[PDB]
């Protein structure tokens, strides 16, 4: 019965500002804290601000002082979250959660429901076609060979092979994002180690966000 | 403000899980334990060090004393598999603190160490001045791994990067980690080292 | 629930 | 789907001693839920699953009579069985019945059975009809015709489609959590090399109930059953089941055979590849 | 008429070192009823070992299941004796980590 | 009249890890002369074994010493395993590293 709902996040660029908006229902919000606790995709969780009851104080984490703002209206029944010079280093996953007790002046006890929150990403967007380098086998069992599709954005890259005729030991990668903002994608096919040169092997990397098709041939040596 | 969580538990199931959140004198503060399954909000499983919210079952316990909190989870479920928080507030921080998480993994599988995948920089790369290191990792199990890059002996601290774990068609776990350089460093070393541990053992290339 | 008797041969 | 219960009693005659061993164990679907044991101190029927000891003195009392006394016809029946095969008294012989019910997916009724056994041998048993008996050897025939004079195919049927599937709808609601549960296989593939040229490709399933499963190789969606192994189904101790079948593999093409894993708590068949 | 047990010797999960396991040996498709079992921490008769109560297949023949609590080290090999009237010697099978 | 055989299991050199050692089987005291004796590398009988030759005490007391080399670790643990006349079932005495 008790709701949480986050909003306003998406895709931001560096610089710019960006409000967090996150909707109650299901207890009296002008009685309880609420909480904002974000997580960057494969990491754990972090304490980001959080807010008593009536607004009254404002508690921040060192890592988002002076940059960050959390609110709420208790008219509304609105936890609100706002991020000015947003950076790369705040793409994360911003959960909104409701403190356990009532009337604490200040954030100490568990948090007991938690919003399904939403995803901020800041980057230097603009689409980009993916260069695609032949990672070739080695020359000295198992033989291993593959595509290298670099600096890519936005997603996604899709890769087959032989236009698709290849499928045993094909496997694709999750895509690295660099530090510069652009994705990284690598996909290789096991074979067998002998037998490699008689067939005709070519990669055909897709990306359509930036309408871009690739074929490389990959060969050793 | 330091509380420090085990990176990965696996355990068969319906035996006894138990994952530790140590920290100075944590004993003296409330702990709390939150589970996150893929994709979803975390979810109250154990708070004040030991109590259990209403639909929590019985199974899981929690515990707190001296320097070391414990979440115990008796008769394993597979579904139990989950990253799990634990919480403090540090009053003499005006912070709340979570733990690193752990990664509880309840196995189907038996365990299988990565097979790491070594690749140089291509010439096609090297002609655009530009060199990178790909090494892949592939078919372990839990999936929980940490990459080290060595040039010759010595650490590599920046311009590496490590994908996150995931599953397999055979649902084992693979990731991949680069290593960004330019074309001069490639040629500096003798010889370059992908180094992945996995469950205490090491496996390089 | 068993059967209620039994069967000789 | 359905479900289904069923009951098996073993009586073995012990030679110089009167009472034989007797042990009747009940299951429902794959879940066993009570066990009599001739030398258990218990002399009571016990219980094996956690759903049924919520039934009370009135039921675990007449449980025991009903198979005190199904015991005892059996020591009888060892003994006239003895005289219809000219048997000695210084042998051992197994008295094996089994019977229970199937019910359908709305409670109804479905199918009844009753089989009984003299050393591993088919000796009498309930035709599909409820109405019939048929008899394996000679011997069974003359507990055939006597049974027709008593109504024994009738009197079966008030049981398999009275009391019998009412235990069977009343178990399944009260333990709706053990055995009303789907178990889909956790599966993983194993690689041995035997020879220089050919190695074993294993494909296993463990943790999965029920216990109906259906491993199969193929070889460039052709189907194998030639290299094939396959294991029956091994308990897993605790309430689950474990299966593995393997292939021999010439080295090299492993990626051509594709093992195939179907099960009831499996939304759609698995594959599994090196 | 008589037949001769198939056995099987596996862990209840996949074994790991150090973590305790249990040690099953199932055998079935036997007849008659009368046979020994036991469990075998190198070439030592395993003592805390319980079986399964005697019910029997489509075809009659029974089946049982001895289990133990065991942890698995990487030295330690374990094995089950089952002997029977069918066998003239007992028969052991070796618990193997992948079968 | 029949003696049932005293065994002693040593090594031939105080054991150290990583070290050709050889590991003895020393039965004596028994009666009549028909013994068997195996060594057993984690329950397995050790197959390059020899023995000594048949020679007897004051009280006509038969002995032999079973050998075999072996190279000790830790995990590895060794035994001898001992079946007589006297003997209903077969005698294990594990080898220690301090006994």
């Known amino acids: 019965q008790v709701q949480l709902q986050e909003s306003g996040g998406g895709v931001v660029q560096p610089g710019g500002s960006l409000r967090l908006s996150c909707a109650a229902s299901?207890?009296?919000?002008?009685?309880?804290?609420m909480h904002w606790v974000r997580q960057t995709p494969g990491k754990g969780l972090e304490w980001v601000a959080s807010?008593?009851?009536?607004?009254?104080?404002?508690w921040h984490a060192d890592s988002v002082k002076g940059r960050f703002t959390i609110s709420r209206d208790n008219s509304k029944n609105t936890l609100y979250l706002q991020i000015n010079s947003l950076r790369p280093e705040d793409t994360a996953m911003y959960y909104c959660?409701?403190?356990?007790?009532?009337?604490?002046?200040?954030?100490?006890?568990?948090?007991?429901?938690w919003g399904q929150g939403t995803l901020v990403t800041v980057s230097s967007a603009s689409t980009k076609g993916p260069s695609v380098f032949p990672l070739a086998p080695s020359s000295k069992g198992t033989a291993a060979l593959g595509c290298l599709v670099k600096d890519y954005f936005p997603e996604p890259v899709t890769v087959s092979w032989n236009s698709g005729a290849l499928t045993s030991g094909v496997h694709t990668f999750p895509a690295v994002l660099q530090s510069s903002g652009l994705y990284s994608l690598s996909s290789v096919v096991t074979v067998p180690s002998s037998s490699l040169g008689t067939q005709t092997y070519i990669c055909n990397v897709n990306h359509k966000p930036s309408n871009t098709k690739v074929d490389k041939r990959v060969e050793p040596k | 403000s330091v509380s420090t969580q085990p990176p990965s538990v696996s355990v068969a199931p319906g035996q006894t899980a138990r994952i530790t959140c140590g920290g100075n004198?944590?004993?003296?503060?409330?702990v709390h334990w939150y589970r996150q399954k893929p994709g979803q909000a975390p979810v109250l499983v154990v708070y004040?060090?030991?109590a259990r919210p209403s639909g929590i079952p019985e199974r899981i316990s929690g515990s707190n004393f001296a320097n070391t909190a414990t979440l115990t989870i008796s008769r394993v479920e597979a579904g139990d598999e989950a990253d799990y928080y634990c919480?403090?507030?540090?009053?003499?921080?005006?912070?709340?603190?979570f733990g690193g998480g752990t990664k509880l993994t309840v196995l189907g599988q038996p365990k299988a160490a990565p097979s790491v995948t070594l690749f140089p920089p291509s010439s096609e790369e090297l002609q655009a001045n530009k060199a990178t290191l790909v090494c892949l990792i592939s078919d372990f199990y839990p999936g929980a791994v940490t990459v080290a890059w060595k040039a010759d002996s010595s650490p590599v601290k920046a311009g590496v990067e490590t994908t996150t774990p995931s599953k397999q068609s055979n649902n084992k776990y693979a990731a991949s980690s680069y290593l960004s350089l330019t074309p001069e460093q490639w040629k500096s070393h003798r010889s370059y080292s992908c180094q992945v541990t996995h469950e205490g053992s090491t496996v390089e290339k | 629930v068993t059967e209620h008797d039994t069967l000789l041969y | 789907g359905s479900h289904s219960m069923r009951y098996f009693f073993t009586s073995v005659s012990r030679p110089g001693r009167g009472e034989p061993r007797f042990i009747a164990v009940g299951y429902v679907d794959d879940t066993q839920f009570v066990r009599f044991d001739s030398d258990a101190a218990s002399q009571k029927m016990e219980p094996r699953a956690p759903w049924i000891e919520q039934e009370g003195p009135e039921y675990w009392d007449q449980e025991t009579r009903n198979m005190k006394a199904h015991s005892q016809t059996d020591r009888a029946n060892l003994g006239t069985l003895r005289g219809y095969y000219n048997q000695s008294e210084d042998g051992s012989h197994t008295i094996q019945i089994m019977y229970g019910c199937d019910v359908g997916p709305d409670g109804r009724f479905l199918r009844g059975y009753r089989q009984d056994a003299y050393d591993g041998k088919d000796y009498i048993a309930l035709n599909e009809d409820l109405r019939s008996w048929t008899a394996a050897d000679m011997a069974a025939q003359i507990t055939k015709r006597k049974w027709e004079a008593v109504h024994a195919a009738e009197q079966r049927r008030v049981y398999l489609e009275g009391r019998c599937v009412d235990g069977l709808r009343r178990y399944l609601e009260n333990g709706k959590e053990t055995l009303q549960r789907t178990d889909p296989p956790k599966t993983h593939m194993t690689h041995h090399p035997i020879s220089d040229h050919e190695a074993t490709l294993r494909c296993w399933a463990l943790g999965f109930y029920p216990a109906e499963i259906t491993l199969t190789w193929q070889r460039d969606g052709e189907d194998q059953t030639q290299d094939t192994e396959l294991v029956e189904t091994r308990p897993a101790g605790d309430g689950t089941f474990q299966k593995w079948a393997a292939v021999v593999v010439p080295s090299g093409e492993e990626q051509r055979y594709t093992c195939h894993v179907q099960h009831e708590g499996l939304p759609k068949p698995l594959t599994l590849r090196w | 008429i008589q037949r001769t047990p198939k056995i099987q010797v596996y862990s209840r999960h996949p074994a790991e070192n150090g973590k305790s396991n249990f040690l099953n040996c199932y055998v079935s498709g036997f007849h008659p009823s009368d046979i020994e079992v036991d469990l075998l921490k190198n070439g030592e008769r395993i003592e805390k070992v319980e079986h399964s109560d005697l019910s029997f297949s489509k075809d009659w023949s029974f089946y049982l299941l001895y289990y133990t609590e065991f942890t698995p080290t990487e030295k330690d090999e374990y094995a089950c004796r089952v002997n029977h009237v069918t066998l003239s010697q007992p028969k052991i099978v070796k618990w193997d980590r992948d079968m | 009249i029949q003696r049932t055989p005293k065994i002693q299991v040593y090594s031939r050199h105080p054991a150290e890890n990583g070290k050709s050692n050889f590991l003895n089987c020393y039965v004596s005291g028994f009666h009549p002369s028909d013994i068997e004796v195996d060594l057993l590398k984690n329950g397995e009988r050790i197959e390059k074994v020899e023995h000594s030759d048949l020679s007897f005490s004051k009280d006509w007391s038969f002995y032999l010493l079973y050998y075999t080399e072996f190279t000790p670790t830790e995990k590895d643990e060794y035994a001898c395993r001992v079946n007589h006349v006297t003997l209903s079932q077969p005698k294990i005495v594990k080898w220690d590293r301090d006994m």
């Open positions: 959660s409701k403190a356990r007790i009532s009337y604490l002046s200040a954030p100490a006890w568990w948090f007991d429901p």
């Open positions: 299901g207890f009296n919000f002008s009685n309880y804290g």
């Open positions: 807010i008593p009851y009536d607004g009254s104080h404002q």
């Open positions: 004198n944590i004993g003296s503060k409330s």
């Open positions: 004040d060090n030991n």
């Open positions: 919480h403090v507030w540090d009053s003499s921080s005006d912070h709340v603190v």
